Amino acid sequence: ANQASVVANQLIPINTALTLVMMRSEVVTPVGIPAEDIPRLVSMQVNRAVPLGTTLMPDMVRGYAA
């Protein structure tokens, strides 16, 4: 129900280290990476371009394992 996920706050370019400005929290479906993981994700890289408003999924972040 009100599980919030990490959502792209701007287009995130491929192979670019995540910064706090790039990540917002929103209740979306399907559910993606939990919004409490935003601190964890800083400096991790995405393996593909992530368009604005896209929910970040585990498979999109290199090295992510919950």
What tokens were used for 27? 């209740």
Quote the Cα angle for 41-46-47, to 5°: 150
Buried (b) or exposed (e) across 7-19, using 16+ Cβ within 10 A? Answer: bbbeebeeeeebe
Would you call the peptide bond into 30 cis, given omega within 30 degrees of 0 as the criterion?
yes
Phi, psi (deg, nearest 5) at residue 7: -125, 140
Could you say which architecture CATH assigns to the domain 1-66?
Alpha-Beta Complex (3.90)
- Pair 6, 23: CB distance under 8 Å: yes
CA–CA separation, 35 vs 65, rounded Å? 14
CA–CA separation, 51 vs 63, rounded Å? 20
Method of structure determination: X-ray
Domain ranges of the chain: 1-66
Would you call the peptide bond into 39 cis, given omega within 30 degrees of 0 as the criterion?
no
